[model samples]
Target: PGVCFKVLTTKEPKANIKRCYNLPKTNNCLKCVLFVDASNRMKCIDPNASWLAERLYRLKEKGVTCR
Candidate 1:
């Protein structure tokens, strides 16, 4: 229901990712987004990134929430 203004094309360090949020396509954003709280900094990355799925899974299993 929200859109990201910008996104990173490169992968972030997995150790730095603290939290994540899913951003769906909106009026201004045509692509799905993956918003991340990396060491308390805000960043958006491609939802389809190869490393993303594994990262999310591990994070969730470790009690990290992403929605």
Candidate 2:
């Protein structure tokens, strides 16, 4: 005899609201995307995780913006 198995997955929905701040609404701005290496050695993968903590610390010391 044999057995069968099934798997399922799901993703959260995205929000449509612009800004959540109490400040006045401003002009609409275009979105920009930045791609960074996601390998274990890449800094963006784990900004606060163990593998990239040292690099992130150095960036903080230099006042570099990761965004």
Candidate 3:
């Protein structure tokens, strides 16, 4: 099982996300998703989240590769 077994549509502050991964589409997963590891927490964030797009770029700049 992958980290994005379940996804959350709820919004989270940008600062709340500590780590992220641009989930690759696979057999069990069709649509792409962003898996997030927050302050002592982990969940898959909805791609439609308002702050997500920029956050992914920022995290990448911070040296967190979305692999």
Candidate 4:
């Protein structure tokens, strides 16, 4: 069987790493998590974010199964 999950909303645009860390700890195996940029202007790029996204995508594609 397969399941689909979605995060309701994104986090703050400038949310710190600590915030992200706390999320997984609080909600383990969450299928998705979104973070919206609440700023009017553009911001610097975060290479790590792309990496994290890719990892998450792969997990979803693989249809993660938890015992």
Candidate 5:
């Protein structure tokens, strides 16, 4: 197998236009942060909530960079 996806990923919606996980049209993401530790990809918690956010962003070693 190519290997399964992650718990959270930076991979885009693949084909969605208006509902992409990346919020480029809103200011609601200031509370969010992104990082690539290259391990565990880093366990995340929403800075805005007690629980996890609706989506998570992960980085595969060979996946495209978040840059």
Candidate 6:
């Protein structure tokens, strides 16, 4: 288990984190959190946009640990 897990989007987000950001709270899984960033590290998409979140998750669902 990790302190935090993360995923990225293949395409640009419909809305940036600044406009659709949601910070994760402490000790809860239902946290539709996002890190609002202008750089490539911004994504606060979840419950707000299930389609967006689902798309993001599917894209990052690559199975790889080592070559």
- Per-model TM-score, in order, reads 0.66, 0.26, 0.56, 0.25, 0.19, 0.30
Q: Candidate 1: minimum summed lDDT over ten consecutive residues — where?
A: 1-10
Output the better candidate (2/5) by lDDT.
5
Q: What is the lDDT of residue 44 in candidate 1?
A: 70
- Model 2, 31-61: lDDT tens per residue? 2111123231111131223533454355457
Model 4 regions lying over 4 Å from their true place:
1-48, 65-67
Per-residue lDDT of model 4, residues 2-62, tens digit only: 2222333332243322112112313333433432223423222232354556544454465
| Leading candidate by lDDT | 1
Question: Which candidate, 1 or 2, has the higher TM-score?
Answer: 1
Q: What does candidate 6 score in Cα RMSD to the true structure?
A: 9.2
In TM-score terms, candidate 1 sits at 0.66
Q: 3 or 5, which is superior by lDDT?
A: 3
| Candidate 6 pairs with clashing backbones | 34-44
Q: After superposition, how far is residue 11 of candidate 3 from its true place, in Å?
A: 1.5
Task: Write one digit per residue (lDDT tens) for candidate 5, span 1-67.
Answer: 1122233333333221211122222333232334334342432223454332333322323343332
User: Total backbone clashes of model 1?
Assistant: 0
Model 3 CA deviation exceeding 4 Å by range: 13-18, 24-40
Per lDDT, what order, best first? Answer: 1, 3, 6, 4, 5, 2
Kindly report which residue stretches of model 5 are placed more than 4 angstroms away from their true locations once superposed.
Answer: 1-25, 31-33, 42-66
**Cα lDDT, all candidates:** 0.62, 0.26, 0.60, 0.33, 0.30, 0.43
Worst 10 residues of 4 by lDDT: 16-25
Q: How far is candidate 5 from the true structure (C-alpha RMSD, Å)?
A: 13.4
TM-score, candidate number 4: 0.25
Model 5 clashing-pair count: 2
Local error of candidate 3 at 24, Å? 5.7
lDDT of candidate 6 over 1-67, digit per residue (tens): 1224344333446533332344454564335544443454545345455476554454346321110
Q: State the lDDT of candidate 3 residue by residue for 1-67, as single tens digits.
A: 2554444555655455556666655566634445556565556666677876787777778777665
